[PDB]
C-alpha cells in the first residue's frame, strides 16, 4: 500500500517505517494533491493524525480542488481530529471550490459535536456556501434541530457577557 493508503487505513507501524528517513515525504501529495494527513483525517484515524502532526506534517496543505484535512475531518464529524488540527492553527474558515467551509460541512452532516467544537473556536457563522445557504440556513432547512440549538446557543454568547 502507498503511504496515503497506510495513513487512510491507520496502518501506523507500516507508515512509521515508510517515513523512517524523516524528510519531506511526510507531506508527499498523491495524484489529487492529498497528503497522508488528509487521508488519515478523512478516515477519522486519530492515532495516525496525532503521529503525523507530532512528526511535523503540514496541516495547511490543500489538495487540487482545495480539499483540506480540516474540511474532510469535519465532513466525517471527527470532532477530536478537528480539535487536533485547530491546535495547529489551521484556517478554521478554509473555503474550497465545492462551495463550503468546515462549519458548513459539519452542519450538512448533522455533526452536532463537531459544529459545537468549530463554534467554540470561533468559526464564522455568517459565511454562506456558494449555494447561498448559511450554516443556520442549512440546519433550519434540513430540520437538524440539535444543530440549530447549538448554533442558537453560540449566537446568544456572541451578544451577551
Amino acid at each position: 500500500l502507498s503511504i496515503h493508503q497506510l495513513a487512510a487505513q491507520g496502518e501506523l507501524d507500516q507508515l512509521k517505517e515508510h517515513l523512517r528517513k524523516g524528510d519531506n515525504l511526510v507531506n508527499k501529495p498523491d495524484e489529487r494533491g492529498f497528503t497522508p494527513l488528509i487521508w488519515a483525517s478523512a478516515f477519522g484515524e486519530i492515532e495516525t493524525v496525532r503521529f503525523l502532526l507530532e512528526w511535523g506534517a503540514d496541516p495547511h496543505i490543500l489538495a487540487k480542488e482545495r480539499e483540506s484535512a480540516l474540511s474532510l475531518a469535519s465532513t466525517g464529524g471527527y470532532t477530536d481530529i478537528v480539535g487536533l488540527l485547530l491546535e495547529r492553527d489551521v484556517d478554521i474558515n478554509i473555503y474550497d471550490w465545492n462551495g463550503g467551509t468546515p462549519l458548513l460541512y459539519a452542519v450538512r452532516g448533522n455533526h452536532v459535536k463537531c459544529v459545537e467544537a468549530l463554534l467554540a473556536r470561533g468559526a464564522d457563522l455568517t459565511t454562506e456556501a456558494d449555494s447561498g445557504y448559511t450554516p443556520m440556513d442549512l440546519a433550519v432547512a434540513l430540520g437538524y434541530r440539535k444543530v440549530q440549538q447549538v448554533i442558537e446557543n453560540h449566537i446568544l454568547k456572541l451578544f451577551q457577557s
Binding site: 500500500l1 493508503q5 487512510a8 487505513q9 489529487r32 492529498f34 487521508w39 478523512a42 478516515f43 480539499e67 474540511s71 474532510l72 465532513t75 466525517g76 474550497d96 465545492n98 462551495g99 463550503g100 458548513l104 460541512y105 450538512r108 452532516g109 456556501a129 456558494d130 449555494s131 445557504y133 442549512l138 432547512a141 434540513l142
Partner: peptide, 16 residues
C-alpha cells in the same frame, strides 16, 4: 484493500 476518499458534500438540500 484500497479505500475511497469520501466526497465533500453538496451544500444544498439535494438528497436531504
Amino acid at each position: 484493500t484500497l479505500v475511497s476518499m469520501p466526497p465533500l458534500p453538496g451544500l444544498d438540500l439535494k438528497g436531504s
